[PDB]
Symmetry: C3
Subunit: 280 residues, 3 copies
């Protein structure tokens, strides 16, 4: 609800790749608690994260991150020998940095943004099978003073599924009118998609919010995305539109018909959702 | 011309009608339905009540992008805001100005290039309705936005422009110096790239740069997918002159198969060099 | 670093379309030196370029440019009769302009940006055969004060290939840690792609670098593009990540599996690449 602090901490987490039911694989922070999508990793600009990574599987797996600073030995590719053999262990190091003026007078961009990590080694040296099986997760890097949300939810279009779930099964998210909700939106696989939210909109820039009246960024409620794109935004749940079962879906028509649909359930402060009949 | 501040309450009648050969269109008067539907233009703060009547024998709905509306004007079967055959229904669209919220952040205004379309014909995503022609443009202006001399709507709907047969345009005319506004909407199954000859715009809300500090990329080509919408303004023939200036989808098989048209920019006498 | 001057020069260049091996076709500034992609053309806003064009092929060809100012007679299309006949010649003229205030108070965008040129006429009236055969290349228009790079490399996604090369053959690019490297990224053909670089990122705006702390442009390392899109950016090779063989690839999974992959080789000051097996 406040603002992101300045970074600079050194953080440590243990991560596991495990098989799940149905031929799927997931990352998790504790043995037996892997999920799809993987756990959310949140860092402030300047932080260093060491991932003590254990592969509990019987096939090689890796961890590759978009956006952040990492040396070649934390690449997560077979090519640079930064994959993890079955039963093996590896320490991955992710660094982040603040923006700032260089000596040549140019502006060096910071790490802040909506990013993601995924496998690069299962199935093919591009991770095609590992990604398909669920080896993916979100990474948020915040800049000093960024508005922090009340809740963050992660939406992944993975080929024809949302979060590797069966068609027509959400996921659904709940909020109360006035909550500041953050959506992390990641795409993977073979297909392009368009992400659409009923009754809400956002700015097409780093944070999803206009910086002020001078920000010329387009305001949208529909965004085309391709494999390994990531973006995020913050909305005020129900702002100007009120409570109800607000649909989000891919707007590619056949994807919508296949079941790439979910609900943003926005409740009144008394817990009620007007008009909501879940048999409809 | 500059857009004024909004705040007016407006009313319109809208109808859904069957058209020739399987098509469906929206109209503001009975018998006047078109594809694309009629252009709805609002200034931030305006409120629009759409008194809607379904004259067809199947259910139909009206759902809008970008604008403020309560759940009862969602236009989805899921929330029971569709319209039965022969039935009527008032949809209410609101708009708002930008402004600082109490928490200190900036609330985006409604201004932008938007669209409305059906959400229940064929499927509960409106696949059949959109295919048949139930879509149209919506422009919300901010106080002080530059107003054009004309506005043209280009809809890439699957493999057609505005549901027209291949190789039939549409073509639009202007005169050298005209301030021409383009609304560009995409629907259906396919991604597209929209491409203009002789002209370019900025990839931001209005299609024009705000000034020398605007870092937005200036482009003559834009990828777009189903339900994307954007717009821009150009001075017809600026720095390039009169002529028949192609626009087309730049996916090669789409241009070859007929997603092509002309922007006919005339000299003041009415002639178009080379055409 | 270097900075771009103001423009306003009138330049003249000769350009040829020639046949190459394997049914391919390319542009070149000297007979017998056509290449795919075609030669890089760099202008400063305000420059005028006259292209004295010669078609050495047996089919009509044309030169169509994006983003720049040109009259209908340099449009490069059959419908405007601005193609070039077999063995014919034609002068194409491209102009550019600075940004400025129109008399009505609105701001006129400048010509600066990452653009490209290509055929519009070989095979179909959209140039489908010409583009597939290799008739395409980069144009960079710079604005006064834009920072200049140490090196510019052009990557073109054309259908399922990079730069019409066979699958998995790169191209690979070399730099030394700290080099200011400029990438021009053009897409052509039938398919959408996503372009991804390992270890590096850029700003999604005109130059690929933030203007400063007020610039809200998304910073990205992955970008969707479709036929005839062009963008570009500059990076500092290895900045914050070090030397290594840094993969770039289309991130559409089947495309990377089929060979839309290449290497950005960032060398230590002593010319070696840690962990890289030549
Ligand atoms: Cu990556
Ligand atoms: Cu989709
Ligand atoms: Cu919608
Ligand atoms: Cu919808
Ligand atoms: Cu990746
Ligand atoms: Cu198309
Ligand atoms: Cu063009
Ligand atoms: Cu929609
Ligand atoms: Cu063209
Ligand atoms: Cu690709
Ligand atoms: Cu990769
Ligand atoms: Cu083109
Ligand atoms: Na932008």
């Amino acid at each position: 609800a406040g603002a992101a602090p300045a970074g600079g901490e050194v953080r440590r987490v243990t991560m596991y790749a495990e098989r799940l039911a149905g031929g799927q694989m997931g990352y998790g922070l504790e043995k037996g608690k892997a999920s799809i999508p993987g756990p959310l990793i949140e860092l402030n600009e300047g932080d260093t994260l060491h991932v003590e990574f254990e592969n509990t599987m019987d096939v090689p797996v890796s961890l590759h991150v978009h956006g952040l600073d990492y040396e070649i030995s934390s690449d997560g590719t077979k090519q640079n020998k930064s994959h993890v053999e079955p039963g093996g262990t590896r320490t991955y190091t992710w660094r982040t940095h603040e923006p700032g003026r260089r000596a040549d007078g140019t502006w060096r961009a910071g790490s802040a943004g909506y990013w993601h990590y995924h496998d690069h080694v299962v199935g093919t040296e591009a991770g095609t099978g590992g990604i398909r099986n669920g080896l993916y997760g979100p990474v948020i890097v915040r800049r000093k003073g960024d508005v922090l949300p009340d809740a963050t939810h992660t939406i992944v279009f993975n080929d024809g599924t949302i979060n590797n779930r069966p068609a027509h099964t959400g996921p659904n998210f709940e909020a109360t009118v006035g909550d500041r909700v953050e959506i992390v939106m990641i795409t993977h696989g073979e297909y392009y998609h368009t992400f659409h939210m009923h009754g809400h909109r956002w700015a097409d820039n780093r944070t999803g919010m206009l910086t002020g009246p001078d920000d010329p960024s387009q305001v949208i409620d529909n965004k085309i995305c391709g494999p390994a794109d990531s973006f995020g935004f913050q909305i005020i749940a129900g702002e100007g539109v009120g409570a109800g079962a607000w649909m989000y879906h891919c707007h590619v028509q056949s994807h919508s018909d296949m079941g790439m649909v979910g609900l943003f359930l926005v409740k009144k402060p008394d817990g009620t959702i007007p008009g909501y009949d879940p048999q409809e």
